[PDB]
């Protein structure tokens, strides 16, 4: 409904994945990012720790933190 902060959290990174042209986000292994979308596809539009947004394969990333 409103306030995206409700259903929106961060995610971790499993394998490495550098950008190709500009869309893709520079992921890595052990690092985590910030999710801004959640479309019906594995690739989202999340940003890393550099104020930059790109794509993040759902399978490649997981939960930003795990207790």
PDB file of C-alpha atoms in Angstrom:
ATOM      1  CA  UNK A   1       0.000   0.000   0.000  1.00  0.00           C
ATOM      2  CA  UNK A   2       2.128   2.931   1.241  1.00  0.00           C
ATOM      3  CA  UNK A   3       5.537   3.391   2.960  1.00  0.00           C
ATOM      4  CA  UNK A   4       7.924   1.077   1.045  1.00  0.00           C
ATOM      5  CA  UNK A   5      10.033   0.797   4.245  1.00  0.00           C
ATOM      6  CA  UNK A   6       7.389  -1.692   5.497  1.00  0.00           C
ATOM      7  CA  UNK A   7       8.026  -4.593   3.084  1.00  0.00           C
ATOM      8  CA  UNK A   8      11.625  -3.722   2.097  1.00  0.00           C
ATOM      9  CA  UNK A   9      14.917  -4.905   3.656  1.00  0.00           C
ATOM     10  CA  UNK A  10      18.540  -5.570   2.600  1.00  0.00           C
ATOM     11  CA  UNK A  11      20.221  -8.756   1.275  1.00  0.00           C
ATOM     12  CA  UNK A  12      23.614 -10.519   1.373  1.00  0.00           C
ATOM     13  CA  UNK A  13      25.767 -11.672  -1.601  1.00  0.00           C
ATOM     14  CA  UNK A  14      26.731 -15.307  -2.338  1.00  0.00           C
ATOM     15  CA  UNK A  15      28.979 -15.355  -5.435  1.00  0.00           C
ATOM     16  CA  UNK A  16      30.744 -12.472  -7.231  1.00  0.00           C
ATOM     17  CA  UNK A  17      29.044 -10.568 -10.090  1.00  0.00           C
ATOM     18  CA  UNK A  18      30.571  -7.393 -11.608  1.00  0.00           C
ATOM     19  CA  UNK A  19      28.622  -5.003 -13.887  1.00  0.00           C
ATOM     20  CA  UNK A  20      28.656  -5.449 -17.692  1.00  0.00           C
ATOM     21  CA  UNK A  21      27.529  -2.092 -19.130  1.00  0.00           C
ATOM     22  CA  UNK A  22      25.861   0.023 -16.409  1.00  0.00           C
ATOM     23  CA  UNK A  23      22.624  -1.618 -15.184  1.00  0.00           C
ATOM     24  CA  UNK A  24      24.207  -4.620 -13.457  1.00  0.00           C
ATOM     25  CA  UNK A  25      25.337  -3.859  -9.876  1.00  0.00           C
ATOM     26  CA  UNK A  26      28.877  -4.774  -8.723  1.00  0.00           C
ATOM     27  CA  UNK A  27      28.004  -7.594  -6.298  1.00  0.00           C
ATOM     28  CA  UNK A  28      30.545  -9.872  -4.550  1.00  0.00           C
ATOM     29  CA  UNK A  29      30.822 -12.683  -1.977  1.00  0.00           C
ATOM     30  CA  UNK A  30      29.985 -12.035   1.702  1.00  0.00           C
ATOM     31  CA  UNK A  31      29.001  -8.406   0.956  1.00  0.00           C
ATOM     32  CA  UNK A  32      25.358  -7.255   1.288  1.00  0.00           C
ATOM     33  CA  UNK A  33      23.228  -4.651  -0.550  1.00  0.00           C
ATOM     34  CA  UNK A  34      19.990  -2.647  -0.250  1.00  0.00           C
ATOM     35  CA  UNK A  35      16.797  -3.763  -2.048  1.00  0.00           C
ATOM     36  CA  UNK A  36      14.537  -1.051  -3.512  1.00  0.00           C
ATOM     37  CA  UNK A  37      12.232  -3.211  -5.700  1.00  0.00           C
ATOM     38  CA  UNK A  38      10.890  -6.809  -5.809  1.00  0.00           C
ATOM     39  CA  UNK A  39       9.453  -7.328  -9.305  1.00  0.00           C
ATOM     40  CA  UNK A  40       8.384 -10.780 -10.524  1.00  0.00           C
ATOM     41  CA  UNK A  41      11.966 -11.663 -11.598  1.00  0.00           C
ATOM     42  CA  UNK A  42      15.199 -12.821  -9.880  1.00  0.00           C
ATOM     43  CA  UNK A  43      17.018  -9.621 -10.948  1.00  0.00           C
ATOM     44  CA  UNK A  44      15.998  -6.641  -8.777  1.00  0.00           C
ATOM     45  CA  UNK A  45      17.137  -3.000  -8.540  1.00  0.00           C
ATOM     46  CA  UNK A  46      19.206  -2.921  -5.320  1.00  0.00           C
ATOM     47  CA  UNK A  47      22.170  -0.671  -4.415  1.00  0.00           C
ATOM     48  CA  UNK A  48      25.501  -1.564  -2.789  1.00  0.00           C
ATOM     49  CA  UNK A  49      27.580   0.376  -0.210  1.00  0.00           C
ATOM     50  CA  UNK A  50      28.587   3.067  -2.737  1.00  0.00           C
ATOM     51  CA  UNK A  51      25.308   4.985  -3.296  1.00  0.00           C
ATOM     52  CA  UNK A  52      24.960   3.144  -6.636  1.00  0.00           C
ATOM     53  CA  UNK A  53      21.970   1.114  -7.909  1.00  0.00           C
ATOM     54  CA  UNK A  54      22.028  -1.839 -10.336  1.00  0.00           C
ATOM     55  CA  UNK A  55      20.709  -5.408 -10.652  1.00  0.00           C
ATOM     56  CA  UNK A  56      20.889  -8.141  -7.977  1.00  0.00           C
ATOM     57  CA  UNK A  57      19.945 -11.770  -8.890  1.00  0.00           C
ATOM     58  CA  UNK A  58      17.695 -13.105  -6.073  1.00  0.00           C
ATOM     59  CA  UNK A  59      19.519 -16.474  -6.136  1.00  0.00           C
ATOM     60  CA  UNK A  60      22.897 -14.700  -5.893  1.00  0.00           C
ATOM     61  CA  UNK A  61      21.858 -12.621  -2.832  1.00  0.00           C
ATOM     62  CA  UNK A  62      19.933 -13.563   0.335  1.00  0.00           C
ATOM     63  CA  UNK A  63      19.166 -11.770   3.669  1.00  0.00           C
ATOM     64  CA  UNK A  64      21.441  -8.832   4.649  1.00  0.00           C
ATOM     65  CA  UNK A  65      21.914 -10.470   8.086  1.00  0.00           C
ATOM     66  CA  UNK A  66      21.232 -13.929   9.581  1.00  0.00           C
ATOM     67  CA  UNK A  67      20.947 -14.513  13.357  1.00  0.00           C
TER      68      UNK A  67
END
